[PDB]
Amino acid sequence: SQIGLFSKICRVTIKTLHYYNKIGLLVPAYINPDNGYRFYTSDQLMKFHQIASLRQLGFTITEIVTLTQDENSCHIIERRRLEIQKQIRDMADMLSRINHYLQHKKKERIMLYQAALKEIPECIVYSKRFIVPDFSSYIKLIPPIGQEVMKANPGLTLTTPAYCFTLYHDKEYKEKNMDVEFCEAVNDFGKNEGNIIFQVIPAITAVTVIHKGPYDSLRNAYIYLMQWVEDNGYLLTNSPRESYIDGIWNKQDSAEWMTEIQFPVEKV
């Protein structure tokens, strides 16, 4: 059976048979030496059937070489079983994500906020946890802390890139009784004089959305994020953070400012 007839028997292209010969997966029975023409037999169709049966299960080519040459190799198929289970979980989450994205673009003509699930590493921060009467009053008392901590810790260099955020330790919603904890990441340990202390903040996977503009609309992102958090079945494992990209330090106009709200979540 010449390669054309055989390629139509097994119903696959010629280049596929060329490739399977090139990698040594399916070798013709008899190659004519001067022309190089490949001729197969029935016992090449018998092997191509096994090859295609394994290849419909997603096995990579080298995995098929091993599956056909090494017997009692059930650990590689089980490994592939676990990987396929992981991709099914991931694809179902993707389904929920794309349903929510389509649900939004029909709900609003503009996508104001996209939600990204990113991993944030562990940090070394100086932290002050305290009650706040008003979030507007919360903004002013931070540069005093900036003076104070650099005073008490000489030569303490903050991490680059700068990570300056807020934990919201409140389990429900209110506007004037916010129990917050301001954390900012530095390089080394330090002195703990004052309400300012040092602590290690563990690495977390968190869904974050970046809101750009003034802070009075920031709650929007939270409602959105909360929707997201409930829609895709994620569970909020820790208190929500808010990391400051743009603000009074870089830029003077308060409408081009930008913060990023981060929800610590776990997949359940």
Ligand X SMILES: C[C@H](CCC(=O)NCCC[N+](C)(C)C[C@H](O)CS(=O)(=O)O)[C@H]1CC[C@H]2[C@@H]3[C@H](O)C[C@@H]4C[C@H](O)CC[C@]4(C)[C@H]3C[C@H](O)[C@]12C
Partner DNA sequence: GCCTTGACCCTCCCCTAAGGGGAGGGTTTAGATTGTGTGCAGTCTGACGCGGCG
Partner DNA sequence: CGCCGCGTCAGACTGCACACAATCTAAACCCTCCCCTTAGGGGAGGGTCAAGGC
Q: 35 vs 147, which CB is nearer to DNA?
A: 35
Contact with ligand 118 (CB under 6 A) among 6, 224, 244, 263: 244
Q: Which two tokens stand for residue 1?
A: 């059976």
Q: Does 240 bind ligand X (CB under 6 A)?
A: yes
Q: Does 218 bind ligand X (CB under 6 A)?
A: yes
The whole-angstrom separation of Cα 181 and Cα 19 is: 61
Helix count and strand count (H, E) for the chain: 8, 11
CA angle 169, 202, 211 (to 5 degrees): 60
* Helix intervals (H) in 70-218: 74-107, 135-140, 142-152
Q: Does 249 bind ligand 118 (CB under 6 A)?
A: yes
Q: Which stretch binds ligand 118 (CB under 6 A): 29-37, 143-151, 172-180, 227-235?
A: 143-151
Q: Does 77 bind ligand 118 (CB under 6 A)?
A: no
Q: Which two tokens stand for residue 171?
A: 């389990």
Q: Which stretch binds DNA (CB under 7 A): 6-14, 144-152, 162-170, 185-193?
A: 6-14
- Please say whether the beta carbons of 131 and 178 come within 8 A: yes
Q: Does 168 bind ligand X (CB under 6 A)?
A: yes
Q: Does 260 bind ligand 118 (CB under 6 A)?
A: no
The whole-angstrom separation of Cα 197 and Cα 199 is: 7
Contact with ligand X (CB under 6 A) among 8, 79, 219, 251: 219
The whole-angstrom separation of Cα 211 and Cα 260 is: 6
- Please say whether the beta carbons of 107 and 81 come within 8 A: no
Contact with DNA (CB under 7 A) among 27, 45, 55, 247: 55
Within 148-187, the residues that bind ligand 118 by CB under 6 A are 162, 164, 184
Residues that bind ligand 118 (CB under 6 A): 142-143, 145-146, 162, 164, 184, 244, 247-249
